[PDB]
Amino acid sequence: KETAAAKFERQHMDSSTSAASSSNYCNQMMKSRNLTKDRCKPVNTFVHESLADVQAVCSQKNVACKNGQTNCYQSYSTMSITDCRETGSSKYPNCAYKTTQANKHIIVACEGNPYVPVHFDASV
């Protein structure tokens, strides 16, 4: 089984690019990160910063999670991100995604030792 930390990396990390590359970025990324294998993941955010920068967020602003948990942290700075969301014209196995690039603060849930991101809560 994939560790929570490894799953967060695979689902939300994209350091190789500075910002969403084209309107087809999400269709390409969702498929290659294996998020459309048995079903189209409806929503997924990729962060375009170094893994180190994202992991560092676990030591930044402690805030509540949407679920009420208190192990969430908001990045002090905005980060380049891309939100990928299924378009009404999407249907497995033919997943289709809208690509929305933005620069915002990310909020992640952290856990373990090392204390690293295990869930992407939201972006501001």
Curated annotation (Swiss-Prot):
GO biological process, one term: defense response to Gram-positive bacterium
Chief localisation class: secreted
Disulfide bonds: 26-84, 40-95, 58-110, 65-72
Enzyme class: lyase
Binding positions for substrate per the UniProt entry: 7, 10, 41-45, 66, 85
Protein's cellular compartments: Secreted
Function: Endonuclease that catalyzes the cleavage of RNA on the 3' side of pyrimidine nucleotides. Acts on single-stranded and double-stranded RNA.
Name used for this protein in its record: Ribonuclease pancreatic
Organism: Bos taurus
Gene name as annotated: RNASE1
